[PDB]
């Protein structure tokens, strides 16, 4: 015993859940995977197409191409089920419908785009289902009752369209009144609607099976190879004997105007050929499948011809009774006419609030429902191919079979069971889609995702959409005005296809780009599956209509970008400013949840500009050289400290910030400026070195200016601060670039005709040292210079040579033998590193280093040079600075470099 | 006297310019707008289509639809000229070709996408132009010389294709050898090629004019309304009298097999109708334009019928001599066949290195060239409509006119002038495109934008592309294998259309999004123009072929995203990490060049977390409340200071940073963490408050915890620091949120059943105070509470009421009259503000504020409360803290708020 429903859950349920945040009522509706996602998805996938148009599709396509159609459609919907299940497992499943899951998983932008595309899909589905109920009622149930009587022969077809427009509008107003007053009854009878569907399908299968031994007696009159309609004919014989008199039969009256055979003038085809009774449903074992295994695709108005029976060759006798192809078919038309029979998988998660284990019921339930419906469709394709005549199939309005539903002829009890089950099922699906479209519309309105839809957020006392439903009815009316399933189906399919394409693309993107909170806990979901689904039914969209597809893509893109703009203006306060703000924040967040290191090391600079007492940059060359080093790409944070109290220097801080920004723009530096007003310059710099940049956009190198004239100045703070900064950089594990004689560094406008960047590779930290000159040579200033590596001190050397080879930029390496004592400070530091994982000697060896370095590189344009670490005791800081100063004595332009990190 | 060229400038020139950075040789090639951009664009727009296919297009389309075609094509190319001129004016114009301008203006990603799409365009253009030269040579000049002789009747069509494949491949190998050896000769004779084009067009116009009084004698034999071919017939008469004997004419031999009229069996149409000589070129004043003003669009193999002459009605006599429609035409086919006649506008800026005033010559020159060619095409459409028979036009191979070029019949001297001018012009355009395609390819390779194309960067001694040209020849070969202009033209047009679509879309985007360095200094460029162009010829792309267009879009999208990925990996060092890094940097940069303020104010928080001596967050509730306030969206920077020396606390800093990150993730705070190891907690906080965040992603509110137990602690630093931070926030012009009793703030899991957020709006800073509660109520925790504004102190009040109404969230405002003395500290501060633009009294009035505030709001869940500024003298800091403490004495949870900024 159960009272379940297949409808959706809109804002009313999501709100109930959110309020229930802070139960016995909830526990009772809890439903297992079967009755919670299998049956809702099954009842919503089985639409009207399977009946009113599957026989026609099989016939006009040939079992092979019909199999291809059903398989392609089922493939898009299955890959979308896998992607939607990936969405279902990821994170908590909201209590609302599938829209809320998709929204909370893909962000409001995709949520709103998918919501509106799926909503237009559902409205045009209410239109197609009402058209189908009207077509079944009007063509098969009560043909006599029509608003417009059949007039002449040319207009009779138009009269049917008018009959459908008027009847469909009346029926749509009825369905809207029903959903508005008494949707509870729809919930109550969803089970009866599913019963009708399943009884109908079992009747189809029972008929197909019974058709093996005892097939039914539905014969078709056929004149030669020209199929005749049997709506008015009684006997498939030229002369109908009456009262022992061979009076001519009515068909004579329909091909000959005498009607008394008194020297009757019968047309050509009638006199030559013969009328025959062809069994319309041969046995399943009869083997007709071999006959109808091939496409027909006859254009509009062509007579339907069985290519089996005999025939004369005369032509010209065009007649009304000849059953005609009612639409110019094609493959791309058949896929569109058939696709709205696989839509409805989002209904699998339309009942997610009333579930027990959502992430477990929804994926399995949805995929099993799609497997069931795909098997039903792919099996019925073959059964129709192998049980129905290849001519009764192409009859799209049950002509030639006395006006019975084509699939109806295959049933155990009678075609009536199917002709009524399809009518009740199709009106039930119409009611379902007139409840599912406005609930989704009020959920998109209540989310305030899109502003102008705010009017439709208004709900009834019970939380029913009063003003969303009216718009849904208006759009369904616009649909019904095209009173033909064959023309509404491409539009419906295009909207649902856009919904499925976005659901597959958002998943593929969020899996590739490592979007935060994208944890698809599914045992079989791989982004290639969602991508293959997106591709399959992008192709499906375009195949069915290349102009409708572009219109849908542009509509969805505009809704998406407009939702993004409104979200920006909502959270940041401005439209485009806030849009870029959100882009930056989202990129940085995505940047956080990832491996901290990078497979390659690239210097992201923090230029430490020193501000004089006039608050002017004491070294613009720092910026010039930073621009040359980064070449306008990458991250360059220009930091500077203003000594003083912040409470009274805010104006100065703003002025100096504008100054530094103008200087950066003048030196073609693309980057950011940050000023810290600090009480102590050393502490200000120690805070800039470790705090610049938003998390994930940190620097990794600190570019400093050498403290020129340290000995001359009486104050010892200037030289002692540089060492303090060096220690801070080393402790923070950042690279260090101490530029010396920076006043002589070349400007952005001048160039070097010829020169040598003399990188000195010493025992360790070879990665940064080698990488620098090439980044410099990539700039126009240092473009025309050569590179010479004067190595002083096996496996690492070989690795370096290989890395240079990969670099592909010409560089010559020379190894100069040096006494260990001369390089003692280096070897000492290296030993300290290996174990981790004097002054007179240091100076007397630094002068040897001077001898070699000047003798080899005196005339270089830029001498890179590895650094030794600062002393452990801060007492030998003077000795350390003297060591550096002598080590660099006599060189024109030195870039002291210290790795101090895992640089690769 | 001048020796100019119309070719492009590749890497060789761009490199020369860059080297010349640091002249007499350059000055001599300087060329004015006319000979620099007008004539190159004019010589490259006038292709083969105008001749070999314009007459056919006019005929098979009708002057009206042909006018529509030419106008739509010219409209896309004109809007693209406007967008390309906007690119040309913006910034310095590089010396290379149009590729370099487009690259430096739209970034390397669009540069490479446009480069490759335009390159495939140019290669398939070399294929079409070689096919055209072969078709002209083979069909009109020397029909007798063909590799394959006519095969039967129907096959003869296939034989022509083989004749074209073999001749075209031979000609393509010739053109490749010519461009490889002696491109200088191509530069020398570009002027002769332009001469041929212009002489040909003036000959067309002179013929059209001469056709007013004296039209030429090109008659056409027509049998009834069936046009006959005249390649073999001599007299348009059934019987050709020979030697005074009325012997039957050859056409008798082509419709009757007797050939001697001895009881000849002539077919039906021949015996009934009559052969007539219809003047093929009636006068311009004859008025035939009224006849050919309508489309024909006859499908393949249909006989071309003049709907003017008399005719019998018998049918069946299918014959070889009946001129047939050679391709199943349609509008969408004609637009594709005609579009490669408007392409070539990027050649306007193919000579930008040798210009005087680039930003002035290129826009005017290009637009004038497009106006000239559009006028020539739109004028020739009408002239062909009004001068050529409506049957000679639909003849696509000069049949029925004795095998002469259709447009050739309209010329002053003879059709020979045009038939040779078109051949020389088309081989010249083939040479041009086999020099323009490989130059562009080596420029895309040398830029190292795309890695795998690196092989093609290899150049000859002079800087000619040795290995790019071979690939261009291979792709042109693949094109020639489809030996028909009518089938190569859609592919060429699709590639060039993709190039133009990207050139229009990049401009529209960079204008809307305010991309840095996008200064379009043009007097008429508006992004709506570029957008309209993008839309027009996106429609053109899809119209011509919906599957080729998707293939082109996907190819261009993949090249674009792959270039973006390679740039990320190049500059940042990682692929996806670096990709997000570049996205963030670009967003922040774009964010810098904009108005600093925002039309709306939204709190971007800096949570100041206090770290205890155990290095644990002393107040997680700060984070919880920050999460509730921002609701997971926006910017939240969690800053904290570790007291100590950074040189030895790096490990602790990393540990505490991980701790704070885990806490943030536990409290659902999405944001970033920054630790500053400082010598003094107060100075560390003063540096965090002013330095957090990358420029443009700054905070604007500082969220602090109240210094609980300030009086109990003997140390006065704890209470004095809070005031110092308040002063720093106020001076920095940031908002301030002092949370008091923060240990009692509700957690993210619990909720409030019912409660009142009692915002106290006091004299000023009403914007932040009102905005806060609504952001709080937007969270599930504070969702179920109400809001009560207890205003204490006209126009501003009305503005506040209106703002509350806009907010749309229910709130009740109560104004309580209070004595000015009680609010003295507030009124005093307000007066200080108005002028800019005791303690016993303060305490005795704070207790009155206590009386009122507790009597009204004692049981509130959260009391917001405006703050007075800190005292000017730092001596009264104890009095200020006592004032605050009493003012908040007895309230459960207080959020002291201070605006101190231009909050709106
Ligand atoms: C149903 O019967 C009609 C009556 O003959 C068929 O019409 C004619 O069918 C032939 C195929 O048998 C069509 O092609 C013809 O083929 C012969 C084979 O040699 C060829 O000699 C003819 O020139 C022609 O190509 C023919 O077009 C068609 N119509 C006429 C006016 O003859 C009809 O095809 C039959 N239906 C099916 C499905 O076969
Ligand atoms: C060139 O001459 C031929 C020879 O008659 C034309 O063929 C026939 O042209 C008529 C139009 O006059 C086509 O339509 C017919 O119209 C009459 C008008 O009453 C109608 O009674 C017929 O039933 C038919 O609809 C006809 O299809 C066409 N072919 C045959 C076999 O008759 C041809 O149209 C002429 N070309 C042009 C451009 O007019
Ligand atoms: C029509 O029927 C007669 C006798 O039943 C038969 O002889 C004739 O061949 C038939 N014609 C065709 C086209 O089958
Ligand atoms: C053919 O020509 C004869 C005499 O010139 C004329 O009488 C007849 O009407 C013509 N037939 C047609 C169809 O014009």
Tab-separated table of N, CA and C in Angstrom, chain B residues 138-217:
chain	number	residue	atom	x	y	z
B	138	UNK	N	41.278	26.398	-69.313
B	138	UNK	CA	40.840	25.135	-69.872
B	138	UNK	C	39.505	25.276	-70.576
B	139	UNK	N	38.572	26.013	-69.979
B	139	UNK	CA	37.235	26.121	-70.533
B	139	UNK	C	37.193	27.189	-71.611
B	140	UNK	N	37.834	28.337	-71.394
B	140	UNK	CA	37.673	29.431	-72.330
B	140	UNK	C	38.874	29.620	-73.238
B	141	UNK	N	40.101	29.552	-72.719
B	141	UNK	CA	41.254	29.856	-73.560
B	141	UNK	C	41.590	28.697	-74.487
B	142	UNK	N	41.966	27.557	-73.926
B	142	UNK	CA	42.357	26.417	-74.748
B	142	UNK	C	41.499	25.214	-74.387
B	143	UNK	N	40.291	25.115	-74.934
B	143	UNK	CA	39.443	23.953	-74.636
B	143	UNK	C	40.006	22.654	-75.182
B	144	UNK	N	40.649	22.710	-76.351
B	144	UNK	CA	41.164	21.512	-77.009
B	144	UNK	C	42.200	20.782	-76.163
B	145	UNK	N	43.062	21.509	-75.460
B	145	UNK	CA	44.107	20.866	-74.673
B	145	UNK	C	43.567	20.459	-73.309
B	146	UNK	N	43.395	19.157	-73.117
B	146	UNK	CA	42.924	18.596	-71.862
B	146	UNK	C	43.568	17.226	-71.687
B	147	UNK	N	43.864	16.874	-70.435
B	147	UNK	CA	44.466	15.572	-70.150
B	147	UNK	C	43.504	14.452	-70.505
B	148	UNK	N	42.228	14.627	-70.179
B	148	UNK	CA	41.199	13.634	-70.443
B	148	UNK	C	40.217	14.180	-71.466
B	149	UNK	N	40.005	13.406	-72.537
B	149	UNK	CA	39.022	13.754	-73.600
B	149	UNK	C	37.597	13.482	-73.093
B	150	UNK	N	36.580	14.003	-73.788
B	150	UNK	CA	35.181	13.833	-73.314
B	150	UNK	C	34.852	12.342	-73.175
B	151	UNK	N	34.236	11.957	-72.055
B	151	UNK	CA	33.831	10.543	-71.837
B	151	UNK	C	32.312	10.452	-72.021
B	152	UNK	N	31.858	9.851	-73.127
B	152	UNK	CA	30.402	9.705	-73.398
B	152	UNK	C	29.750	11.090	-73.325
B	153	UNK	N	28.643	11.207	-72.583
B	153	UNK	CA	27.967	12.514	-72.412
B	153	UNK	C	27.971	12.910	-70.930
B	154	UNK	N	27.354	12.082	-70.078
B	154	UNK	CA	27.275	12.344	-68.615
B	154	UNK	C	28.670	12.293	-67.976
B	155	UNK	N	29.488	11.314	-68.375
B	155	UNK	CA	30.856	11.132	-67.811
B	155	UNK	C	31.743	12.339	-68.148
B	156	UNK	N	31.582	12.910	-69.353
B	156	UNK	CA	32.351	14.096	-69.834
B	156	UNK	C	32.476	15.118	-68.697
B	157	UNK	N	31.459	15.218	-67.842
B	157	UNK	CA	31.564	16.109	-66.693
B	157	UNK	C	32.672	15.645	-65.754
B	158	UNK	N	32.751	14.336	-65.502
B	158	UNK	CA	33.809	13.802	-64.649
B	158	UNK	C	35.172	14.012	-65.288
B	159	UNK	N	35.244	13.883	-66.613
B	159	UNK	CA	36.518	14.062	-67.290
B	159	UNK	C	37.036	15.466	-67.050
B	160	UNK	N	36.142	16.456	-67.027
B	160	UNK	CA	36.601	17.812	-66.774
B	160	UNK	C	37.225	17.892	-65.391
B	161	UNK	N	36.620	17.221	-64.403
B	161	UNK	CA	37.182	17.261	-63.059
B	161	UNK	C	38.577	16.677	-63.060
B	162	UNK	N	38.780	15.564	-63.762
B	162	UNK	CA	40.129	15.007	-63.821
B	162	UNK	C	41.076	15.974	-64.515
B	163	UNK	N	40.600	16.629	-65.571
B	163	UNK	CA	41.421	17.598	-66.283
B	163	UNK	C	41.855	18.703	-65.344
B	164	UNK	N	40.969	19.075	-64.430
B	164	UNK	CA	41.256	20.150	-63.498
B	164	UNK	C	42.148	19.663	-62.374
B	165	UNK	N	41.938	18.460	-61.858
B	165	UNK	CA	42.825	17.980	-60.809
B	165	UNK	C	44.252	17.911	-61.324
B	166	UNK	N	44.460	17.289	-62.483
B	166	UNK	CA	45.828	17.159	-62.973
B	166	UNK	C	46.413	18.522	-63.344
B	167	UNK	N	45.652	19.370	-64.047
B	167	UNK	CA	46.195	20.669	-64.424
B	167	UNK	C	46.417	21.553	-63.211
B	168	UNK	N	45.516	21.496	-62.237
B	168	UNK	CA	45.664	22.306	-61.050
B	168	UNK	C	46.844	21.886	-60.208
B	169	UNK	N	47.058	20.584	-60.045
B	169	UNK	CA	48.246	20.155	-59.324
B	169	UNK	C	49.515	20.589	-60.042
B	170	UNK	N	49.563	20.452	-61.366
B	170	UNK	CA	50.739	20.946	-62.075
B	170	UNK	C	50.927	22.441	-61.853
B	171	UNK	N	49.845	23.205	-61.942
B	171	UNK	CA	49.936	24.646	-61.755
B	171	UNK	C	50.312	25.009	-60.326
B	172	UNK	N	49.834	24.248	-59.345
B	172	UNK	CA	50.189	24.514	-57.957
B	172	UNK	C	51.659	24.245	-57.709
B	173	UNK	N	52.202	23.187	-58.303
B	173	UNK	CA	53.634	22.961	-58.178
B	173	UNK	C	54.406	24.081	-58.857
B	174	UNK	N	53.871	24.620	-59.949
B	174	UNK	CA	54.540	25.748	-60.589
B	174	UNK	C	54.508	26.979	-59.693
B	175	UNK	N	53.351	27.283	-59.107
B	175	UNK	CA	53.240	28.479	-58.280
B	175	UNK	C	54.113	28.362	-57.038
B	176	UNK	N	54.185	27.171	-56.445
B	176	UNK	CA	55.065	26.967	-55.301
B	176	UNK	C	56.518	27.170	-55.695
B	177	UNK	N	56.935	26.648	-56.848
B	177	UNK	CA	58.311	26.908	-57.267
B	177	UNK	C	58.550	28.396	-57.498
B	178	UNK	N	57.583	29.093	-58.090
B	178	UNK	CA	57.744	30.525	-58.333
B	178	UNK	C	57.906	31.282	-57.021
B	179	UNK	N	57.024	31.027	-56.050
B	179	UNK	CA	57.131	31.758	-54.788
B	179	UNK	C	58.405	31.374	-54.058
B	180	UNK	N	58.847	30.128	-54.193
B	180	UNK	CA	60.061	29.720	-53.506
B	180	UNK	C	61.291	30.370	-54.119
B	181	UNK	N	61.308	30.541	-55.431
B	181	UNK	CA	62.464	31.090	-56.134
B	181	UNK	C	62.005	32.345	-56.864
B	182	UNK	N	62.163	33.500	-56.236
B	182	UNK	CA	61.884	34.730	-56.946
B	182	UNK	C	60.636	35.471	-56.519
B	183	UNK	N	60.305	35.418	-55.227
B	183	UNK	CA	59.172	36.172	-54.710
B	183	UNK	C	59.346	37.659	-54.989
B	184	UNK	N	60.587	38.107	-55.185
B	184	UNK	CA	60.821	39.503	-55.522
B	184	UNK	C	60.101	39.854	-56.812
B	185	UNK	N	60.054	38.911	-57.750
B	185	UNK	CA	59.349	39.151	-58.999
B	185	UNK	C	57.858	39.325	-58.747
B	186	UNK	N	57.313	38.578	-57.785
B	186	UNK	CA	55.915	38.753	-57.411
B	186	UNK	C	55.682	40.152	-56.859
B	187	UNK	N	56.570	40.615	-55.978
B	187	UNK	CA	56.472	42.001	-55.521
B	187	UNK	C	56.540	42.977	-56.687
B	188	UNK	N	57.401	42.701	-57.664
B	188	UNK	CA	57.563	43.628	-58.776
B	188	UNK	C	56.308	43.691	-59.633
B	189	UNK	N	55.647	42.559	-59.847
B	189	UNK	CA	54.506	42.506	-60.752
B	189	UNK	C	53.159	42.572	-60.051
B	190	UNK	N	53.127	42.763	-58.732
B	190	UNK	CA	51.856	43.070	-58.082
B	190	UNK	C	51.174	44.264	-58.740
B	191	UNK	N	51.958	45.252	-59.168
B	191	UNK	CA	51.369	46.399	-59.844
B	191	UNK	C	50.745	46.004	-61.173
B	192	UNK	N	51.399	45.122	-61.930
B	192	UNK	CA	50.813	44.661	-63.185
B	192	UNK	C	49.539	43.871	-62.944
B	193	UNK	N	49.507	43.072	-61.883
B	193	UNK	CA	48.287	42.340	-61.575
B	193	UNK	C	47.151	43.300	-61.257
B	194	UNK	N	47.426	44.336	-60.465
B	194	UNK	CA	46.377	45.314	-60.196
B	194	UNK	C	45.950	46.011	-61.480
B	195	UNK	N	46.906	46.305	-62.357
B	195	UNK	CA	46.578	46.889	-63.651
B	195	UNK	C	45.610	46.007	-64.421
B	196	UNK	N	45.882	44.704	-64.475
B	196	UNK	CA	44.980	43.792	-65.171
B	196	UNK	C	43.587	43.833	-64.566
B	197	UNK	N	43.494	43.784	-63.237
B	197	UNK	CA	42.180	43.832	-62.594
B	197	UNK	C	41.429	45.104	-62.980
B	198	UNK	N	42.073	46.263	-62.830
B	198	UNK	CA	41.361	47.522	-63.040
B	198	UNK	C	41.024	47.725	-64.507
B	199	UNK	N	41.908	47.320	-65.412
B	199	UNK	CA	41.574	47.420	-66.824
B	199	UNK	C	40.379	46.541	-67.130
B	200	UNK	N	40.322	45.362	-66.519
B	200	UNK	CA	39.186	44.487	-66.751
B	200	UNK	C	37.887	45.107	-66.258
B	201	UNK	N	37.889	45.681	-65.057
B	201	UNK	CA	36.649	46.274	-64.552
B	201	UNK	C	36.224	47.477	-65.389
B	202	UNK	N	37.174	48.312	-65.799
B	202	UNK	CA	36.800	49.419	-66.666
B	202	UNK	C	36.288	48.911	-68.001
B	203	UNK	N	36.806	47.785	-68.486
B	203	UNK	CA	36.257	47.202	-69.703
B	203	UNK	C	34.829	46.715	-69.501
B	204	UNK	N	34.522	46.125	-68.345
B	204	UNK	CA	33.135	45.748	-68.064
B	204	UNK	C	32.229	46.967	-68.106
B	205	UNK	N	32.629	48.042	-67.432
B	205	UNK	CA	31.772	49.225	-67.420
B	205	UNK	C	31.662	49.851	-68.800
B	206	UNK	N	32.756	49.879	-69.552
B	206	UNK	CA	32.699	50.456	-70.884
B	206	UNK	C	31.791	49.641	-71.782
B	207	UNK	N	31.839	48.320	-71.658
B	207	UNK	CA	30.905	47.492	-72.391
B	207	UNK	C	29.467	47.746	-71.992
B	208	UNK	N	29.202	47.839	-70.691
B	208	UNK	CA	27.838	48.098	-70.248
B	208	UNK	C	27.315	49.415	-70.807
B	209	UNK	N	28.159	50.443	-70.836
B	209	UNK	CA	27.740	51.739	-71.363
B	209	UNK	C	27.531	51.656	-72.866
B	210	UNK	N	28.513	51.108	-73.588
B	210	UNK	CA	28.387	50.947	-75.031
B	210	UNK	C	27.157	50.129	-75.377
B	211	UNK	N	26.727	49.270	-74.467
B	211	UNK	CA	25.559	48.448	-74.700
B	211	UNK	C	24.272	49.238	-74.649
B	212	UNK	N	24.327	50.558	-74.503
B	212	UNK	CA	23.094	51.335	-74.509
B	212	UNK	C	22.647	51.607	-75.936
B	213	UNK	N	23.517	52.231	-76.731
B	213	UNK	CA	23.219	52.461	-78.140
B	213	UNK	C	23.564	51.255	-79.009
B	214	UNK	N	24.812	50.795	-78.959
B	214	UNK	CA	25.271	49.689	-79.798
B	214	UNK	C	25.665	48.485	-78.956
B	215	UNK	N	24.761	47.538	-78.739
B	215	UNK	CA	25.128	46.316	-78.036
B	215	UNK	C	25.804	45.343	-78.982
B	216	UNK	N	26.572	44.389	-78.464
B	216	UNK	CA	27.313	43.476	-79.335
B	216	UNK	C	26.413	42.384	-79.893
B	217	UNK	N	26.927	41.717	-80.916
B	217	UNK	CA	26.168	40.703	-81.642
B	217	UNK	C	26.474	39.299	-81.126
